[PDB]
C-alpha cells in the first residue's frame, strides 16, 4: 500500500539477488533457495510470489512444472549465461 | 506451463536484456515512457510491459510506484534502486 512498505519489501528481494550473485553455485535446489531467501527476511509464505517475480524478471530460471527431475526442483541463479548460450547455439 | 521450458527461457531472456540495458544506462531515474521505450528496444511488446514492470518492481530491480500521489514518483522508474534501498535503511535505521 504505502510507498515505504513497498520499497522495503522490495529491498529484501534485492538482497536476495545480491546473495545469489555472491554464491559460487549457479544451480541450487528450491529448498536451498527458500533458505537463502529466509536469510534476508523473506518468509516461506512469500517465496512463491518472489520466485515468480524473479522468474518473470529473467533473474532466475525456475521451472517447477517441468517433467525433468533435475529442472523441477532447481533454481538457476545466474541465468544470463544460459540465455546467451541458448541464443548462440540455436542461432536466434 | 508444462512443456514450455524453451519458450519460457527465451521469453525471460528479453527481460534479462532489459535489466542489462538499465544497468548500462547512466541515468538512475527515467520516466515510465522512457522505460517503455527501452523495453520495446529489447523486443518487449506494449501489451506485456505492465506485467514486466510489475515483475521487475517485485524482484526489486526497479522502483516504480504508479499508485503514489506524488506526481513525480507516480510517473518515474528508478533503474538502480539498490542505492535507494541502502540509503533508506541508513537514514531511518531499519
Swiss-Prot record, chain A:
Which domain of life does the protein's organism represent? Eukaryota
Q: Which organism is it from?
A: Dictyostelium discoideum (Social amoeba)
Domain comment in the entry: The selectivity filter, in which calcium ions are arranged in single file, is composed of two acidic rings separated by one helical turn along the central axis of the channel pore.
Q: What family does the entry list? A: Belongs to the MCU (TC 1.A.77) family.
Function according to Swiss-Prot or TrEMBL: Mitochondrial inner membrane calcium uniporter that mediates calcium uptake into mitochondria. Constitutes a pore-forming and calcium-conducting subunit. Mitochondrial calcium homeostasis plays key roles in cellular physiology and regulates cell bioenergetics, cytoplasmic calcium signals and activation of cell death pathways. Sufficient to operate as a pore-forming channel without the need of calcium-sensor or auxiliary subunit.
User: Where's it found, cell-wise?
Assistant: Mitochondrion inner membrane
Subunit notes for this chain?
Homooligomer.
Question: Which ranges does the record list as Mitochondrial matrix topological domains?
Answer: 1-92
Give the shown range, full length included: 29 to 120 of 275
**What does the UniProt record report as the effect of altering residue 32 to A in this chain?**
Impaired homooligomerization
Indicate what this protein is called per its UniProt record: Calcium uniporter protein, mitochondrial
| Cystine pairings recorded for this chain | none
Impact when changing residue 44 to A? Impaired homooligomerization
Amino acid at each position: 500500500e504505502g510507498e515505504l512498505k513497498t520499497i522495503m519489501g522490495q529491498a529484501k528481494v534485492s538482497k536476495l539477488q545480491e546473495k545469489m550473485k555472491l554464491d559460487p553455485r549457479s544451480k541450487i535446489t528450491f529448498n536451498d533457495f527458500k533458505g537463502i531467501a529466509k536469510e534476508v527476511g523473506i518468509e516461506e509464505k512469500e517465496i512463491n510470489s518472489v520466485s515468480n517475480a524473479l522468474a518473470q524478471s529473467g533473474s532466475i530460471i525456475y521451472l517447477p512444472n517441468s517433467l525433468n527431475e533435475n529442472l523441477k526442483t532447481s533454481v538457476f541463479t545466474k541465468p544470463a549465461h544460459i540465455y546467451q548460450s541458448l541464443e548462440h547455439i540455436l542461432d536466434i
